[PDB]
Design a protein around this ligand. Structure first.
Ligand SMILES: Nc1nc2c(ncn2[C@@H]2O[C@@H]3COP(=O)(O)O[C@H]4[C@@H](O)[C@H](n5cnc6c(=O)[nH]c(N)nc65)O[C@@H]4COP(=O)(O)O[C@H]3[C@H]2O)c(=O)[nH]1
Length: 242
């Protein structure tokens, strides 16, 4: 239609919804972690997935505003439990010199505890905008936020990026848990996890949709898992982590 007109209006009328998908600790950590996922609410009140609007938003100069809406609301809902939220950043926000100054004031205004937010950057974006990702993640550390790289492991030399960035969590690409009946894929997954741990990064493995995969990941040493098998995205944070 005019997705752009709809987005412009949505940003001014709270016509978005946050969903939450729990991230589960396998090694005894007590935080109640959730990933925040965004849905646009169309004029009929239906949830529309990021695939249908984030691209057009960025091209129309709206991506930073969408990220600020998500972050502002995450900070709020959080404030309302040892909860930690994983929040996505678009590439536009990576490049935005105003993000850090604004985030600093936004955190203080809600009186948010340290280590409450983890900002997620895709591997592709971390690599494409390496200098900006370096600066942003260093700044996040100064503000006592954490950071993560998601969709990890698909670039030619995925570990090189970590030489430059300040990140505590690494969320590997969902492709790595497909076809785990093949021993080659088991070995690839195990090696990836092992190398992340050598680098003292916490591994998160998503797309867990089966007991065999859950068990394989647990034996491979993954520090956290996520997937429909545990719980899909929901409007409420009521997962039983205990
Ligand atoms: N097959 C399968 N799928 C699963 C499973 N568990 C979760 N998913 C879905 O897999 C996608 C994971 O997010 P992402 O791909 O890393 O990447 C995200 C991220 O790049 C972007 N995104 C979503 N929310 C936000 C947001 O708040 N801000 C920004 N900047 N980007 C967002 O949109 C992408 C897609 O998000 P979603 O449509 O919510 O789609 C999500 C999630 O709903 C599973 O076990 N199996």
């Amino acid at each position: 239609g005019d997705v752009i007109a709809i987005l412009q209006q949505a940003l001014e009328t709270n016509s978005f919804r946050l969903l939450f998908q729990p991230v589960i600790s396998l090694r005894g950590d007590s935080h109640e972690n959730y990933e925040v996922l965004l849905r646009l609410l169309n004029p009929q009140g239906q949830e529309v997935p990021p695939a249908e609007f984030l691209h057009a938003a960025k091209e129309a100069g709206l991506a930073e505003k969408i990220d600020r809406w998500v972050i502002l609301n995450s900070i709020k809902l959080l404030a309302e439990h040892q909860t930690k939220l994983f929040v996505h950043l678009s590439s536009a926000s990576l490049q935005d010199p105003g993000l850090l100054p604004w985030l600093g004031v936004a955190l203080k205004a809600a009186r948010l505890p340290p280590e409450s937010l983890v900002f997620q950057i895709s591997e592709a974006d971390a690599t494409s905008y390496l200098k900006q990702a370096k600066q942003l993640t260093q700044g996040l550390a100064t503000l006592h936020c954490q950071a993560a790289i998601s969709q990890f492991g698909c670039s030619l030399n995925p570990f090189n990026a970590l030489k430059h960035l300040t990140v505590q969590f690494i969320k590997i690409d969902g492709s790595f848990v497909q076809d785990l009946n093949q021993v080659e894929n088991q070995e690839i997954l195990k090696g990836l996890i092992a190398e992340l741990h050598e680098q003292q990064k916490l591994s998160i493995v998503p797309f867990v949709e089966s007991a065999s995969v859950l068990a394989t990941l647990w034996q491979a040493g993954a520090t956290y898992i996520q997937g429909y098998y545990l719980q899909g995205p929901s409007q409420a944070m009521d997962y039983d982590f205990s």
